[PDB]
From a paper:
Disulfide reduction and extended heating at 90 °C is sufficient to fully denature human lysozyme, allowing for the formation of heat-irreversible amyloid fibrils. Using standard single-particle-based helical reconstruction techniques, we were able to produce an initial de novo 3D model from the 2D classes which could then be used for refinement of the irreversible fibril structure of human lysozyme to 2.8 Å resolution. The structural model comprises residues 22–34, 50–128 and an additional 12 residues whose sequence could not be identified, covering more than 2/3 of the amino acid sequence of human lysozyme. Apart from a region of tubular density which could not be modeled due to its low quality the remaining 1/3 of the protein, including the segment 35–40, is not visible in the cryo-EM structure, indicating that these segments are dynamic or heterogeneous in the structure. The amyloid fibril structure is composed of twelve in-register inter-molecular β-sheets (β1: residues 23–32, β2: 51–58, β3: 62–63, β4: 68–69, β5: 74–75, β6: 78–79, β7: 83–87, β8: 96–101, β9: 107–112, β10: 115–119, β11: 120–125 and a 7-residue β-strand of unknown sequence composition). The β-strands are often bordered by glycine residues (i.e., Gly22, Gly68, Gly72, Gly105, Gly127), by prolines (i.e., Pro71, Pro103) or β-arches. Further typical structural motifs of amyloid fibrils are present and include hydrogen bonded glutamine/asparagine ladders (such as the buried residues Gln86, Gln123, Asn60, Asn75, Asn88, Asn118). Furthermore, a complete unfolding of the native lysozyme is necessary for the irreversible amyloid formation as the sequence elements of both the native helices as well as the β-strands of the anti-parallel β-sheet of the native protein fold are incorporated into the amyloid fibril structure.
Numbering used by the authors:
A (entry chain E), B (entry chain G), C (entry chain I), D (entry chain C), E (entry chain A): 22 to 34, 50 to 128
Write the structure that this text describes.
Amino acid sequence: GISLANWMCLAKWRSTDYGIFQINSRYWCNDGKTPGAVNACHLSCSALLQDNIADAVACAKRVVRDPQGIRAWVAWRNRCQNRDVRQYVQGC
Amino acid sequence: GISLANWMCLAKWRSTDYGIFQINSRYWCNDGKTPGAVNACHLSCSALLQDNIADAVACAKRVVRDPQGIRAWVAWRNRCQNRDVRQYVQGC
Amino acid sequence: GISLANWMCLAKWRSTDYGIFQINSRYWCNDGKTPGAVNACHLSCSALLQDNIADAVACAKRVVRDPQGIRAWVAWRNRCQNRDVRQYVQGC
Amino acid sequence: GISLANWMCLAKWRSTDYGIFQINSRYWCNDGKTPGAVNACHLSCSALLQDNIADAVACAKRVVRDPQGIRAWVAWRNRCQNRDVRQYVQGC
Amino acid sequence: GISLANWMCLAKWRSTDYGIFQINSRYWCNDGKTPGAVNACHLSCSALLQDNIADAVACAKRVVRDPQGIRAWVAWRNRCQNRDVRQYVQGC
């Protein structure tokens, strides 16, 4: 992931030292984010998958999906209609 | 994940030292986020999956999904209609 | 997850040292977040799944889903209609 | 992932030293991002997959998908129509 | 991934030294990005896949997809229509 380290040492027989660390930080910003909007989809025998990860830091993900065995998807004579469909997405 | 360490040491026989760490921090910001809005979908024999992770830090996720055995999805003569469908998504 | 450490040491035979750690913190901000809004969906023989994690720190998740054995989803002659459907999502 | 280290040392028998680290940080910015908007799709026996990762730092992802065994997708005489469909995406 | 290191040393028997590191940072910018908008697609027996990675730093991804075994996709006499379909994408 992330590893930081900061050291100082001295010996004897003025000083003003600075360490400033700023990784994912935001200052005076107007951030905005709008991932993954879905509208008016028709799914008959179908899959939709989304990872809408908006801001992760040092995050870990592990996935196993459908290792083994029969999948059958069958469709016939289905009727799907979208009419006058509008999507406005404005992550301003 | 995230590992930080800070050390200081001295020996003898002024000083003013600073350590500032700012990882995912937000200062004076106007952050806003709107992940994963879904509208008016028709699912017949269908799946929709979303990870709308908005801000995680050092988070860990482990998933196993449908390892083994028969899946069958069957659909016929279904009628699905959308009419005058509008989605407005505005993560300002 | 997250590990921090802070040390100081001295020996002999002024000083003013600082350690400031600010991980996921928010200062003076106007944060807002609106993950995962769902509207007017038709699920016939269907699944919808969402992880709307908004702000987690150091969080851990472990999942197992449908390891084994028959799934069958069957639909016929179903009628689904959406008419004049509007969704407004505004995570300002 | 990310590794940083900072050292200082001295011995004897003024000084003001600085270390500034700014990795993924944003200052005075008006950032905005809008990944992965989906509108009005028809999926008969079909898959749609999206990774809408908007801002990750040091993040790790591991995936296994459909290792083994029969997939069959069958569709016939399906009718799908889109009429007067408009999408506006404006990540300003 | 990314490795930084900073050292300082002295011995004896003024100084003001600076180290400024600015990797993926943005200053005074109006950045905006809008990857992967999808509109009005018809998928019969088909797959659509997107990685809409918008801003990753030091991120790692590993994927295994469909290692082994029969895939069959069959479609006949399907009718798909798009009419008056307009898409506007404006990552200003």
